[PDB]
Design a protein around this ligand. Structure first.
Ligand SMILES: C[S@@+](CC[C@H](N)C(=O)[O-])C[C@H]1O[C@@H](n2cnc3c(N)ncnc32)[C@H](O)[C@@H]1O
Length: 93
RNA sequence: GGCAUUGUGCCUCGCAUUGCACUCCGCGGGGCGAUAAGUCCUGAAAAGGGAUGUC
């Protein structure tokens, strides 16, 4: 899939609460770059999943390649580039 | 605070779900104004916060 500012993470432990999940993802991935936002939802369509938006694509690339399959709340993270640009980055340029 | 209607999101349990969102609600039980959260509301914005009717 083509590089993107946003990484799409699925295979997340669904028992983890939205607030704690959002911040855990934020604290871990902030190692790889400045983060613009993280969207997380435990709805049917959106649970187990997350979009973390990075400021710079190099950072998402680095994050995607270094964090692939990482054991996170007893599960390995599946990490892909996002198919389409996030709304916050689509406007900026 | 009791009722009626209701926007908005949250927690938990059973079953189910590997799902590409920002146009956002699995079903079924249970519990929630509490800035937690919020896609709903007020403000010009910061920031703040359920609402209408009703004893
Ligand atoms: C009509 S029920 C809520 C139904 C909900 N829209 C649903 O899909 O199931 C109204 C009650 O829900 C609870 N509630 C709704 N929104 C709340 C919130 N944002 N914070 C705390 N309690 C809430 C309160 O207990 C309130 O008295």
């Amino acid at each position: 899939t083509r590089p993107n500012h946003t990484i799409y993470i699925n295979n997340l432990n669904e028992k983890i609460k939205k607030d704690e999940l959002k911040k855990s993802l934020h604290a871990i991935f902030s190692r790889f770059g400045q983060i613009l936002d993280i969207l997380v939802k435990r709805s049917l369509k959106m649970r187990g999943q997350a979009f973390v938006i990075f400021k710079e694509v190099s950072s998402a690339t680095n994050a995607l390649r270094s964090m692939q399959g990482f054991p996170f709340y007893d599960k390995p993270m599946r990490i892909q580039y996002a198919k389409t640009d996030s709304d916050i980055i689509a406007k900026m340029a």
